[PDB]
């Protein structure tokens, strides 16, 4: 808790759905948004901060609260848009040999600024005396270890808590999340949403030789004609859907009522029957 990591993760597709099956977590409270909607929001960089506290201290990790750890080791303002993911770790972080490894900085002068790490080891000076380094009656060790033992009960066990702070500064967002991708229907007028490029057409197989860097493709006069599949390399062709004008040939309402219907721009296979120019 006095020296916690600040891993700045960016430039990845953060699949938060996988985090629900990595480890048997015991706390997945996200204050900012819903986990379902989190996979559709881009972010610049996520700050992962991990630490170890007791079971009775997990309640102290909140966006604004006091406590022996909430205002002495790690404080969260009232803007935390991440999660408070935490889980018990009383399987490998507790042996009967003396757990004089951790500490929680029992002594302090005042409340620290939220989102700040204080890596200090100086002797706590309780005023009215210059302590150049001494331990008696005026100045003591401001650090104290825990008493984690395997033969104990829940509430005072090693609980690993990791928060994922989110931020959006004046910088382009790198991490966005998963992106669903369906199959591709060939030789059928359907809709497409290829990398923001939205429209409708008949995705057919083309023989165009695109450059290794080109993705989209236009025509002589401002119209998309062929694009590159974001999946395995395949050159497709986007031709607009089947449309035409309907004309009615009628001999007049004086001898009969039989009429003929002419669909323009069709091959009699996309609407006796005759096919003319």
């Amino acid at each position: 808790v006095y020296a916690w990591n600040r891993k700045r993760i960016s430039n990845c597709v953060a699949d938060y759905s996988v985090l629900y099956n990595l480890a048997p977590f015991f706390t997945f409270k996200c204050y900012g948004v819903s986990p379902t909607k989190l996979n559709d929001l881009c972010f610049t960089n996520v700050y992962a901060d991990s630490f170890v506290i007791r079971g009775d201290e997990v309640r102290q990790i909140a966006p604004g609260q006091t406590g022996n750890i909430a205002d002495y080791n790690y404080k969260l303002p009232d803007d935390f848009t991440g999660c408070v993911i935490a889980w018990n770790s009383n399987k490998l972080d507790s042996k009967v040999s003396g757990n004089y490894n951790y500490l929680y900085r029992l002594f302090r002068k005042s409340n620290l600024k939220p989102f700040e790490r204080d890596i200090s080891t100086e002797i706590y000076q309780a005023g009215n005396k210059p302590c150049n380094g001494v331990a008696g009656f005026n100045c003591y060790f401001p650090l104290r270890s825990y008493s984690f033992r395997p033969t104990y009960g829940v509430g005072h066990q090693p609980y690993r808590v990791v928060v994922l702070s989110f931020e959006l500064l004046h910088a382009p967002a790198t991490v966005c999340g998963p992106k669903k991708s369906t199959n591709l229907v060939k030789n059928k007028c359907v809709n497409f949403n290829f990398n923001g490029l939205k429209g409708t057409g008949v995705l057919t197989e083309s023989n165009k030789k695109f450059l290794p860097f080109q993705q989209f493709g236009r025509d002589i006069a401002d119209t998309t004609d062929a694009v590159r599949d974001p999946q395995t390399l395949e050159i497709l062709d986007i031709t607009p859907c089947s449309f035409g004008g309907v004309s009615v040939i009628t001999p007049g309402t004086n001898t009969s009522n039989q009429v003929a219907v002419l669909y323009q721009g069709v091959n009699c296979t996309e609407v006796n029957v005759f096919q003319t120019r």
Partner: single-chain antibody
Amino acid sequence: VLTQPPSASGSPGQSVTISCTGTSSDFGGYNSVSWYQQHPGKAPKLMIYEVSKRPSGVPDRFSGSKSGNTASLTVSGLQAEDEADYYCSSYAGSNNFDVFGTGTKVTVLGGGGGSEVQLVESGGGLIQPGGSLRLSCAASGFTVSSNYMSWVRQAPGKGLEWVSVIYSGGSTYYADSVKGRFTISRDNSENTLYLQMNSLRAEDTAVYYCARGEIQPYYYYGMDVWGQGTTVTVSS
């Protein structure tokens, strides 16, 4: 709520070995059970804080091992003339008051801190019911603004209980007895630190004690020094 023996007078100094049962656990986290010797008149004095390593004092009372689910303070062979009350502290859960015990009469016979830092109070003689009275414990020694102090009240017959806990400079926690009607306000950072009554509800008749150190999360602090209390004497 803890379990303590009402009295203990048989077999003086041979098989007394008083303790405090009613835990049914492993003392929560930090296994630090303190023992306070409340004496009529002057303020109580600490006897031992851990299971071993007794502080500077009487050397005939040690070996407070945690047997079963209770700390058995070995007091046999101490003396044969004492009139005080032994209280133990446990239940170190997060924000859980009432860590003291009930009145245990450990009189083996029955019939037969002053200049350390400071000891001052307000002297609330004939307190009017209500209003706002301030009680201070100005200490010319240890800093009254950096250490972790507390306020504990006790009434005739009833035992002690945690009434006010305050951290270094960023906590103003109150006990469950007041539930909000008590507002702690720190005085000047270099003069003293006082309290506030804030319209008592006729239950504040008990005498107060401003301790320079915490009770349940007690630290060595060099030495444990207490101060005499004052009688509120409400007239509700």
